[PDB]
Amino acid sequence: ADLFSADSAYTFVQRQVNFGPRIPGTAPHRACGDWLVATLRSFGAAVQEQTAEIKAHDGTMLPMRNIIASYRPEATGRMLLMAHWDTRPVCDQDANPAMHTETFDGADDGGSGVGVLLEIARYLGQQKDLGMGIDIVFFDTEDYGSYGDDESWCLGSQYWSRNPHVAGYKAEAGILLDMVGAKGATFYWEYFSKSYAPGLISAVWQTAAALGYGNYFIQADGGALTDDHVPVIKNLGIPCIDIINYSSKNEHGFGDHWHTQRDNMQIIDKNVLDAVGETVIRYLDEQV
């Protein structure tokens, strides 16, 4: 019995990629967001969209579109799962400087976390009685920033955590998935995750260990990464962790495909998606 379908998650990554790059303000972004909403609703979630016009670092006005999907919306004890769904507009880390003005698929950076969570949604919609409320949030406009400028990233999570869909929203725990699909990925303890949610990072990494995934979930320090979980911690006080492919042994910390033309379907590994999905589902089931 396989609780998390790696084949299905892989297909959700490919679906997103086949729309074209999900660049804020563009037609593939609108079409893919439409499909993400319809698909979450077909898996039994109550889905609402949170929209706003946000100013990006270069002055572009972006039509931000956060996607919020809920199971058992009346329950007071809730678990929060997160991923960003936009694609950075340019592969400005490509090894070929001529590519820094071009677009790329965002298969891992964007596709992988959404794909894993769509498959978890499919699983949740089949349960006959959830033991807690569950929210799945896909943040927009995470990846439109500038490297010297931390506030220029994670615009959708900053907006949502300051203006959530219920007043004073609380979840007991929050898990962010970012770049969880590439062959050879290494999930170390991200610093802010460990500093603010030691119990959660311990429970998740220990669950992965018990499932046989200690070759992916490494019990050692990783990077201090500003990501969508940090605004949630700071503004909502929810202990959140980030599961993210990162190692200080990597040239750019992130995997070698990050913000290059090689972040495309050929670097995606079903076994990495499975390790992450099976760990998350097991942890969720053991909370109830």
The Cα–Cα gap between 25 and 116 comes to 25
**C-alpha distance from residue 47 to each of 6, 62, 67, 116, 267 (Å):** 24, 22, 7, 17, 31
259 is in an annotated binding site: yes
| Contact between 143 and Zn ion per CB under 5 A | yes
251 is in an annotated binding site: no
| Contact between 10 and Mg ion per CB under 5 A | no
Nearer to Mg ion, 4 or 104 (CB): 4
Quick one: which of 109, 178, 190, 263 contacts Zn ion (CB under 5 A)? 109
Q: Would strands 173-178 and 217-221 be described as parallel, antiparallel, or unpaired?
A: unpaired
> Smallest distance, Å, CB 2 to Mg ion?
4
Nearer to Mg ion, 143 or 274 (CB): 274
In the chain, where does DSSP find H-type helix? 6-19, 27-42, 113-125, 155-162, 191-196, 198-211, 229-236, 270-287
Which does residue 88 touch among Zn ion, Mg ion, none (CB within 5 to 8 A, set by kind)? Zn ion
> Smallest distance, Å, CB 89 to Zn ion?
10
**C-alpha distance from residue 270 to each of 4, 81, 111, 190, 232 (Å):** 11, 20, 13, 23, 29
> Smallest distance, Å, CB 143 to Zn ion?
4
The Cα–Cα gap between 154 and 146 comes to 11
In 101-254, where does DSSP find H-type helix? 113-125, 155-162, 191-196, 198-211, 229-236
**C-alpha distance from residue 154 to each of 14, 87, 158 (Å):** 24, 12, 6
Nearest to 240 by CA among 286, 190, 282, 279: 190
> Smallest distance, Å, CB 207 to Zn ion?
27
Rg (CA), the chain: 17
149 is in an annotated binding site: no
Nearer to Mg ion, 153 or 283 (CB): 283
Which does residue 143 touch among Mg ion, Zn ion, none (CB within 5 to 8 A, set by kind)? Zn ion
Size of the site for Zn ion (CB under 5 A): 3
| Contact between 129 and Mg ion per CB under 5 A | no
151 is in an annotated binding site: no
Q: Which residues from 226-285 bind Mg ion, rule CB under 5 A?
A: 274
Nearest to 45 by CA among 99, 150, 119: 119
| Contact between 119 and Mg ion per CB under 5 A | no
Which does residue 109 touch among Mg ion, Zn ion, none (CB within 5 to 8 A, set by kind)? Zn ion
Q: Which residues from 39-98 bind Zn ion, rule CB under 5 A?
A: 88
150 is in an annotated binding site: no
| Contact between 4 and Mg ion per CB under 5 A | yes
Residues near Mg ion (CB under 5 A): 2, 4, 6, 274
